[PDB]
Design a protein around this ligand. Structure first.
Ligand SMILES: CCCCCCCCCCCCCCCCCC(=O)OC[C@H](COP(=O)([O-])OCC(O)COP(=O)([O-])OC[C@@H](COC(=O)CCCCCCCCCCCCCCCCC)OC(=O)CCCCCCCCCCCCCCCCC)OC(=O)CCCCCCCCCCCCCCCCC
Ligand SMILES: CCCCCCCCCCCCCCCCCC(=O)OC[C@H](COP(=O)([O-])OCC(O)COP(=O)([O-])OC[C@@H](COC(=O)CCCCCCCCCCCCCCCCC)OC(=O)CCCCCCCCCCCCCCCCC)OC(=O)CCCCCCCCCCCCCCCCC
Ligand SMILES: CCCCCCCCCCCCCCCCCC(=O)OC[C@H](COP(=O)([O-])OCC(O)COP(=O)([O-])OC[C@@H](COC(=O)CCCCCCCCCCCCCCCCC)OC(=O)CCCCCCCCCCCCCCCCC)OC(=O)CCCCCCCCCCCCCCCCC
Ligand SMILES: CCCCCCCCCCCCCCCCCC(=O)OC[C@H](COP(=O)([O-])OCC(O)COP(=O)([O-])OC[C@@H](COC(=O)CCCCCCCCCCCCCCCCC)OC(=O)CCCCCCCCCCCCCCCCC)OC(=O)CCCCCCCCCCCCCCCCC
Ligand SMILES: CCCCCCCCCCCCCCCCCC(=O)OC[C@H](COP(=O)(O)OCCN)OC(=O)CCCCCCCCCCCCCCCCC
Ligand SMILES: CCCCCCCCCCCCCCCCCC(=O)OC[C@H](COP(=O)(O)OCCN)OC(=O)CCCCCCCCCCCCCCCCC
Ligand SMILES: CCCCCCCCCCCCCCCCCC(=O)OC[C@H](COP(=O)(O)OCCN)OC(=O)CCCCCCCCCCCCCCCCC
Ligand SMILES: CCCCCCCCCCCCCCCCCC(=O)OC[C@H](COP(=O)(O)OCCN)OC(=O)CCCCCCCCCCCCCCCCC
Ligand SMILES: Nc1nc2c(ncn2[C@H]2C[C@H](O)[C@@H](COP(=O)(O)OP(=O)(O)OP(=O)(O)O)O2)c(=O)[nH]1
Ligand SMILES: [Mg+2]
Lengths: 54, 120, 172, 320, 345, 140, 98, 51, 105
């Protein structure tokens, strides 16, 4: 329980999830071409959200 | 949110109506804590510049404490006026619209039947 | 003559499509020069010639500078134009086709919205003073010297500051 | 720091205060070759400020009371121990080399500050442009390792191009057997315990890298010993030198002002010498670092800022 | 950098946001934003190395594109209503593109991809002036039109801002990137409270500014751009580690530090407006922000990292670097929690 | 599509299982297209074929998660004869998490997705029963 | 006028699409920015001419001045980029990621 | 937190200056003459020009 | 404005050309000068919230004065109904709508 499974369940799994999430969110290439294409996707999504909210 | 109220002059620290408020007593825990913050600022400054902690810069510590007390006093007067005018507008709207704030009749603990939840 | 402004606006949209499609910046500057010429024509159509003539002259000097910079440093051995690449020409003709389709949809489905075939040429000049002196567009720009002195000083300070900005950047 | 942008506006123009003898002249030679007396006589008879070779205790002599402190405060490196056993496992050789480079950098900053503040020229002995020679001598003799060489090159890259090169570099060409004879005649037994291979590596480092890279950017004055050991003809050459190259020509008042700010704030001077590259030759650790630091603050005259230590006679502490 | 250019550039940097805040004209707000950008470009390129060149180029194209989207919104509003202000009945599309452009000007996620890149490669004082001064005028414009903006778009922008700010600050080691992601999370909080109470947005902006200013000053003390570089501060300047710890804990927002006060009052007003889910998610991502803050504190203050030999010579030398405003801002950003009714309005 | 996700809730749970599965699959597919577009834009593939393959993989994975979640929620509601019970949504969220773990080929992600998506779906059901506002208009 | 304004809105929309979709040339990006500027100028001028707002006629000249200052600063940054890397290719400016 | 897609990263420089490969200077070569009024007909002056 | 230096010092750096019905050069009124004037005097002193509900009549007049959406739709139907009648031939244009009129000054 204590040295294996409660540690595997709550704290180490939370740390693993947040480490994987920060790796995926900051695995960036540093290319502003990709950054501006992402900005275009953001603009398109905001237009879509406004159009469906009306 | 109070910036659109009627009779709102733009950009003055203390309007004339604020002079109708009782001023701070000048020996109260807020201004005493402001002076203590100024003294701690002076001690922090001395320790960071590697001077003696209180044996150096007595004039600097005095200026820090006095400026902190001064700014705290005037800011405290401003917030006292702001809270006073907030309560004044609140009570004015409450008096102006009594049909939205009815004096509800609360019954006593002989007409109200609270449910009983036994612990056993 | 009624759809003259519509033809000009379609040509301006085509020039902006080529500019967005991005050929070599020689051809990009050429497309934006003809877009500035078309925009000058539209301003002259809608009213006072001062604004259109001024933006034409300003972009003539501006893209003089842009062409000089492009032939200096924004060049490669084999410049890329609209038709040298199959993909770029494909999106060019696709954009033209999609523009035609979009104006057809706004003509048919939406009826009198932003585009109307029968109402074209009827709502270009809304109201004009039939008898009157000092109605041209240059009078307001002159009144910037008199009515909007804040606008005059912020434009002048922008140019002065920008001179200092460029000197500091290209100081090297 | 009294000098600043306000002082520059009110007028402290370096080009206004310069003259014909406001030069940085560095004398360089082998380990024992006529270098100390030559620079001293040049400075004496041309009216420049003489700066001897920045040793281990240079920072200790230029800061505080100026007495040489204990070695654990002043670097924990010994030239005598390097001469006795250069390949020791404590890493004394590269520790001494890096400490001497830091001392030379502080001396260069001090000399540049003196030149840009007073206008009087400086005559340095073996400045920072001639310390990679000792680097490469240690490396080719196997005394240090490639990680030490790369770390020194990194610090040299971070600290070198922010300063100006010397106006004149004077070189003394003395052969290796003559260096042997002069070292034997000096009488220091640690200095006798050196190798002709090490001195030949020093001379090779001179002739292959130091002389041309300053030849392309300043005035080079390779002189023999007999042209030397007579510090008057070299002075006539310095007088009739023409400086028509190097980056000193393109400098103006504001570039001098920013360089003066950089060389007067010593923390930015020695900022990049304390990079956190964890090389075991230089790194110390928490316990030893804290013990040495606490002993240094308990040292007399070093507990507070200079001017605030009541034990050394500072007065009006409560009013400043 | 001669004093004439210094005075002109610094006066234009000051004048930009002042014009933007003082102008009742949306166009004059736009031209104030133009002054701010065009004036801060040379201060970014001032080091003249490739990293600052990339940073200045990325900053220029990002703020230029955002400025043109602002100008589109202003011109469309002028076409629709005939005035130069989003008064009450401007189009929601115009308001949303205004929000998009001002958010990408501010640097909040998912428009935040440039901000760590821009603040990296520039000097620390330029990062300070960027992250403090450039974020007042866009927030002023957003404050001017608070009842008209879209609560759902603002709230989703706030959530993604705090999420990617917390994750980025968790990942990076560099000080400037860490403060960039901290800034992204703090703008997430300010936008989260913006549609409901702009006074709380101003309070959070002031608290964040007085929190991030002396942290940047402490970074300027030794030009420490690395976790290790700020870790050997115990040998460099030991009399500052307590203030570093207290300011980083206040940045994390624990009681009784006064940096808990903005998050506390923000979630109080948010729950007054019944968005408890939104407040809870924001608070847990603030806990992640505090996690990377606590890792920084562990690195620099509570443990003593190994030091090198030349730090002895650095301790031999003396410095007059920390100015008069460092201790004042540090104390007012550390121990001002009992003055909470005075700090709020 | 606002009418589409409103017509998700026009019928109580345990009724129109095919309809609820189809709308939930469509919503998961939309979210997968968004995520795939973000992934392709930020981290570009080596080729357009690899990019469209990644878009297809992401869209199919998210559509599978949504389909399994909606299907298992509706089946659990039908079997247990009570629609307004968040345990059905917890079972559906666990099924979606196991679908995610099966697509990613890792039991750790399977269990993680089970717990997190079950909690999220249970909170969603509680909020839709008791009128929680996710993006409330400012009222005070 | 509404068809003209819709065409101008579409011209700005495609110019913004080109601005947001980089190609190999930073000068091509700057030219897309200038197309956005021209689109906005033409909108403001035709709106002022339609509404007869001579009080708002200084607005197009002001956007011309400020956007030309933007163009000047962009050309200065582009000459810095070309001096550093030989060309203005936007894929060269990617070393700030780490 | 190094991974497969970010293990190729290097730490940033301490002074924010990156060493790049020295690009070859493309000074243009002009064949001034021989068919030129200023070359006096028979001079092939090849010119290495910067600008 | 976020800050009110212009209101405090009494200056009008940019407050005098905020709308069409403001000051114009040489007393040449903009389009819908009276309709915007009716909207501004309605909405003053009641706040932004009460302006959207109680000044809807003046704003609706001002909006389609400036945009003419109802004018175009009304005018399009007349041209559409007339053009439909020309196919069936049960309508003819008058001489004064066909270019053959008696002009007047
Ligand atoms: C030596 C030090 C003292 C020198 C005093 C010299 C001057 C003097 O004699 O003044 C007399 C003066 C006479 O006061 P009074 O007009 O008779 O009214 C006093 C009543 O008790 C009326 O006072 P009250 O009890 O009604 O207090 C009013 C109110 C408003 O007062 C305040 O806000 C002041 C709070 C001060 C603490 O206080 C509070 O709301 C208390 C909030 C407590 C929780 C705050 C949570 C944050 C953490 C703790 C505070 C921050 C410490 C530093 C950070 C580290 C935290 C671990 O007494 C004081 O000013 C009392 C406070 C003095 C000590 C201040 C703290 C040290
Ligand atoms: C006037 C006569 C023009 C054509 C003269 C001629 O000899 O055409 C040969 C041409 C056949 O080409 P070729 O002589 O076999 O190939 C060598 C040419 O140099 C190959 O031609 P190039 O190297 O000059 O490149 C042609 C390129 C570039 O040339 C142009 O753009 C010319 C038109 C400028 C107006 O044009 C295109 O790729 C197609 C452009 C289509 C119109 C632009 C539509 C989008 C932009 C809208 C604004 C345009 C401003 O037909
Ligand atoms: C008393 C508490 C407040 C003290 C503030 C000043 C602190 C300071 O300067 O400490 C140094 C100084 C002692 O220095 P020193 O030993 O003389 O020589 C300096 C060393 O050579 C310097 O050696 P070094 O620089 O070479 O290396 C030392 C360095 C090496 O660095 C380290 O070792 C790093 C340590 C890292 C771990 C600690 C991180 C920070 C933790 C902060 C506290 C957190 C927990 C508390 C709860 C949350 C608080 C937000 O630093 C330290 O070891 C610690 C330095 C700071 C210690 C004092 C911290 C004070 C603030 C925190 C405690 C008080 C507030 C919270 C609690 C409130 C009550 C519940 O402390 C004092 O002098 C304390 C003040 C004593 C006189 C008070 C007189 C009051 C008079 C009142 C009447 C007159 C004014 C009337 C005004 C109103 C008129 C109307
Ligand atoms: C909400 C409003 C109403 C709905 C609106 C429409 C739908 C909106 C959906 C929003 C949530 C999803 C957002 C996804 C963003 C991109 C994630 C991604 O894949 O990044 C990878 C990409 C790098 O890809 P890579 O380098 O190839 O990595 C390889 C993988 O590690 C290789 O890993 P792998 O092989 O396992 O790949 C399989 C792939 C397959 O999965 C996907 O492709 C996406 C799956 C999404 C599942 C979660 C949503 C499920 C919803 C079910 C609803 C059921 C019905 C309702 C009842 C229950 C309600 C609870 O999974 C992933 O890639 C997972 C990525 C991490 C996702 C973390 C999501 C956390 C929040 C979840 C709840 C929301 O990272 C980035 O691009 C980083 C920057 C992302 C910035 C995003 C900023 C916006 C996010 C929110 C947008 C909200 C709407 C627009 C608002 C206005 C914005 C301006
Ligand atoms: C029976 C009851 C059941 C119900 C209750 C369950 C919850 C109980 C309470 C939760 C306890 C969580 C404990 C979290 C901390 C422990 C993990 C940890 O210490 O991770 C350390 C690790 C960093 O270690 P590092 O220093 O890099 O390397 C090791 C040696 N150098 O760290 C990492 O790698 C990353 C750490 C990330 C931060 C963790 C703490 C913040 C978590 C925020 C959660 C947000 C939840 C909402 C998320 C969005 C919606 C899904
Ligand atoms: C040195 C400080 C000198 C201060 C001089 C007076 C400044 C002044 O006029 O302040 C008034 C200012 C604006 O007052 P108000 O009309 O309410 O504006 C809306 C703001 N929410 O009031 C405010 O901005 C209120 C908050 C002031 C905070 C000051 C300390 C930070
Ligand atoms: C009921 C529990 C279902 C759990 C599904 C799951 O996520 O399983 C994880 C597992 C990982 O797959 P792996 O370990 O690579 O090997 C299986 C290859 N058939 O994946 C599988 O086992 C997937 C098997 C197919 C789907 C089964 C449901
Ligand atoms: C709103 C909705 C938000 C949903 C947010 C979550 C989305 C689904 C989960 C995504 C997880 C991504 C990271 C991951 O895969 O974590 C699984 C982790 C590591 O698994 P591993 O074998 O290392 O696989 C390679 C990494 N994928 O595997 C583990 O850590 C194993 C943990 C097993 C026990 C987990 C028990 C539940 C823990 C949380 C309890 C909360 C109360
Ligand atoms: N290992 C090492 N030793 C150095 C370095 N710089 C100087 N030394 C040593 C060499 C000598 O033993 C000692 C003194 O050097 P000098 O060249 O000044 O010799 P000295 O003053 O005895 O004679 P001289 O100046 O030649 O007339 O310092 C260095 O960077 N590394
Ligand atoms: Mg000597």
């Amino acid at each position: 329980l204590d040295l294996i499974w409660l540690e595997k369940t709550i704290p180490k799994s939370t740390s693993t999830l947040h480490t994987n999430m920060t790796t995926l969110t900051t695995n960036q290439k540093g290319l502003i071409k990709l950054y501006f294409m992402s900005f275009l996707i953001n603009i398109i999504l905001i237009i879509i959200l406004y159009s469906i909210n009306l | 949110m109070m910036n659109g109220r009627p009779g709102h002059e733009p950009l003055k620290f203390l309007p004339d109506e604020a002079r109708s408020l009782p001023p701070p007593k000048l020996n109260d825990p807020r201004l005493v804590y402001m002076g203590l913050l100024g003294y701690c600022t002076g001690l922090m400054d001395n320790m960071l510049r590697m001077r003696p902690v209180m044996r150096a810069g007595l004039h600097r510590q005095l200026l820090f404490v006095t400026s902190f007390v001064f700014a705290g006093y005037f800011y405290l007067k401003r917030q006292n006026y702001l809270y006073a005018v907030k309560d004044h507008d609140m009570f004015g709207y409450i008096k102006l619209h009594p049909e939205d704030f009815p004096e509800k009749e609360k019954k006593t603990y002989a007409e109200i039947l609270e449910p009983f939840h036994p612990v056993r | 003559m009624n759809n003259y402004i519509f033809v000009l606006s379609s040509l301006f949209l085509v020039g902006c499509l080529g500019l967005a499609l991005k050929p070599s910046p020689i051809y990009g500057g050429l497309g934006l020069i003809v877009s500035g010429f078309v925009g000058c024509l539209m301003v002259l159509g809608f009213g006072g010639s001062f604004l259109g003539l001024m933006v034409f002259l300003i972009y003539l000097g501006g893209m003089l500078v842009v062409f000089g910079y492009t032939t200096a440093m924004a060049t490669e051995e084999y410049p890329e134009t609209w038709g040298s690449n199959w993909l770029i020409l494909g999106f060019l003709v696709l954009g033209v086709i999609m523009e035609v389709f979009l104006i057809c949809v706004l003509n048919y489905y939406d009826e009198v919205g932003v585009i109307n075939l029968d109402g074209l040429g009827d709502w270009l000049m809304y109201e004009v003073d039939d008898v009157g002196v000092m109605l041209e567009g240059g009078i307001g720009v002159a009144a910037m010297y008199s009515c909007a002195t804040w606008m005059m000083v912020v434009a002048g300070w922008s140019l002065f500051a920008g001179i200092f900005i460029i000197i500091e950047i290209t100081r090297d | 720091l009294r000098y600043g942008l306000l002082a520059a506006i009110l007028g402290d123009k370096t080009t206004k205060k310069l003259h014909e003898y406001s030069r940085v002249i560095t004398v360089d030679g082998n380990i024992c070759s006529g270098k100390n007396k030559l620079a001293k006589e040049i400075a004496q008879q041309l009216g420049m400020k003489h700066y001897p070779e920045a040793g281990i205790q240079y920072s200790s002599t230029t800061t505080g009371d100026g007495r040489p402190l204990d070695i654990e405060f002043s670097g924990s490196c010994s030239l005598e121990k390097f001469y006795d056993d250069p390949k020791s496992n404590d890493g004394n050789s590269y520790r001494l080399q890096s400490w001497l480079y830091a001392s030379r950098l502080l001396q260069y900053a001090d000399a540049l500050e003196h030149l840009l503040s007073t206008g009087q020229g400086v005559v340095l002995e073996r400045s920072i442009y001639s310390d990679f020679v000792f680097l490469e001598a240690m490396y080719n003799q196997g005394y240090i390792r490639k990680q030490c060489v790369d770390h020194y090159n990194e610090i040299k890259r971070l600290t070198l191009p922010e300063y100006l090169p010397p106006h004149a570099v004077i070189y003394i060409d003395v052969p290796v057997p003559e260096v042997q004879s002069r070292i034997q005649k000096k009488g220091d037994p640690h200095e006798m315990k050196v190798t002709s291979a090490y001195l030949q590596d020093i001379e090779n480092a001179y002739k292959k890298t130091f002389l041309p890279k300053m030849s392309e950017m300043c005035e080079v004055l390779v002189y023999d010993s007999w042209e030397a050991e007579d510090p008057t003809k070299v002075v006539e050459d310095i007088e009739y030198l023409k400086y028509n190259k190097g980056p000193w020509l393109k400098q103006d008042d504001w570039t001098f002002h920013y360089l003066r700010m950089l060389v007067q704030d010593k923390t930015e001077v020695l900022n990049y010498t304390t990079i956190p590259v964890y090389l075991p030759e230089i790194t110390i650790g928490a316990h030893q670092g804290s013990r040495i630091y606490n002993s240094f603050r308990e040292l007399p005259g070093r507990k507070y800022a200079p001017g605030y230590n009541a034990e050394v006679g500072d007065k009006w502490i409560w009013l400043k | 950098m001669n004093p004439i250019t210094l005075a002109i550039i610094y006066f234009t940097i000051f004048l930009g946001p002042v014009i933007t805040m003082s102008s009742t004209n949306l166009m004059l707000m736009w031209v104030g934003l133009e002054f701010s950008l065009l004036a801060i470009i040379p201060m970014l390129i001032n080091k003249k190395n490739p990293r600052s060149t990339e940073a200045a180029t990325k900053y220029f194209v990002t703020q230029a594109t955002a400025s043109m989207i602002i100008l589109l919104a202003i011109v469309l509003n002028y076409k629709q209503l005939g005035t130069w202000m989003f008064q009450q009945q401007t189009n929601g599309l115009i308001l949303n593109m205004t929000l998009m452009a001002l958010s990408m000007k501010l640097g909040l996620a998912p428009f935040h991809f440039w901000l760590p890149e821009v603040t990296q490669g520039i000097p620390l004082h330029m990062g300070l002036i960027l992250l403090t001064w450039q974020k007042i005028a866009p927030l002023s414009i957003l404050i001017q039109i608070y009842p008209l903006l879209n609560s759902t778009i603002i709230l989703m922008l706030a959530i993604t801002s705090i999420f990617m700010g917390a994750w980025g600050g968790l990942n990076q080691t560099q000080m400037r990137k860490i403060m960039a992601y901290s800034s992204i999370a703090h703008m997430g909080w300010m936008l989260a409270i913006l549609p409901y109470n702009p006074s709380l947005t101003l309070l959070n902006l002031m608290i964040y500014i007085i929190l991030t200013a002396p942290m940047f000053m402490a970074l300027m003390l030794n030009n420490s751009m690395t976790i290790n570089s700020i870790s050997l501060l115990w040998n460099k300047t030991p009399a500052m580690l307590t203030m570093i710890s207290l300011m980083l804990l206040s940045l994390g927002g624990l009681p009784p530090l006064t940096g808990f006060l903005p998050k506390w009052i923000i979630i109080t007003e948010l729950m007054k407006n019944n968005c408890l889910i939104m407040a809870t998610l924001m608070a847990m991502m603030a806990l992640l922000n505090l996690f990377f803050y606590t890792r920084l504190i562990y690195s620099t203050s509570l443990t003593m990292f190994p030091t090198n030999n030349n730090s002895k010579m650095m301790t031999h030398q003396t410095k007059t670097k920390p100015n008069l405003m460092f201790s004042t801002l540090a104390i007012m950003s550390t121990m001002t929690l009992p003055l909470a009714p005075q700090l709020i309005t | 599509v606002k009418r589409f996700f409103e017509s998700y809730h026009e019928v109580p749970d345990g009724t129109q299982c095919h309809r609820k599965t189809y709308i939930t699959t469509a919503l998961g597919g939309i979210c997968g297209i968004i995520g795939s577009a973000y992934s392709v834009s930020l981290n570009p593939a080596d080729s357009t074929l690899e990019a469209v393959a990644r878009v297809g993989r992401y869209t199919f994975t998210a559509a599978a998660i949504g389909a399994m979640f909606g299907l298992t929620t509706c089946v659990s509601a039908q079997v247990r004869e009570k629609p307004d019970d968040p345990l059905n949504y917890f079972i559906g969220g666990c099924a979606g998490g196991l679908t995610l773990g099966a697509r990613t080929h890792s039991y750790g992600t399977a269990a993680m997705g089970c717990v997190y998506m079950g909690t999220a779906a249970a909170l969603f059901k509680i909020g839709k029963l008791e009128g929680w506002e996710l993006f409330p208009t400012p009222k005070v | 006028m509404p068809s003209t304004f819709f065409n101008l809105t579409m011209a700005f929309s495609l110019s913004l699409l080109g601005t947001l979709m980089f190609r190999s040339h930073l000068m091509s990006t700057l030219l897309c920015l200038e197309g956005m500027v021209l689109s906005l100028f033409i909108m403001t001028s035709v709106t002022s001419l339609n509404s007869n707002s001579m009080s708002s006629m200084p607005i197009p000249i002001t956007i011309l001045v400020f956007a030309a200052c933007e163009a000047a600063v962009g050309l200065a940054l582009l000459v810095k980029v070309s001096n550093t890397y030989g060309t203005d290719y936007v894929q060269n400016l990617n070393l700030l990621q780490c | 937190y190094p991974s497969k897609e970010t293990a190729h990263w290097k730490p940033p420089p301490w002074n924010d200056v990156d060493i790049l490969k020295e690009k070859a200077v493309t000074n243009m070569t002009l064949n001034f003459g021989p068919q030129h009024p200023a070359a006096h007909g028979v001079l092939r002056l090849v010119l290495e020009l910067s600008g | 404005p976020f800050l009110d230096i212009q209101k405090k010092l009494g200056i009008s750096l940019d407050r005098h050309f905020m709308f069409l019905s403001a000051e114009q050069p040489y007393k040449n009124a903009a389009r819908c000068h009276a309709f915007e004037k009716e909207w501004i005097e309605c909405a003053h002193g009641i706040g932004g919230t009460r302006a959207k509900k109680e000044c809807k009549i003046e704003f609706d007049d001002f909006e389609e004065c400036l945009l003419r959406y109802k004018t175009m739709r009304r005018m399009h139907d007349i041209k559409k109904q007339r053009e439909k009648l020309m196919k069936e031939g049960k309508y003819t244009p008058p001489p004064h709508h066909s270019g053959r009129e008696e002009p007047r000054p």
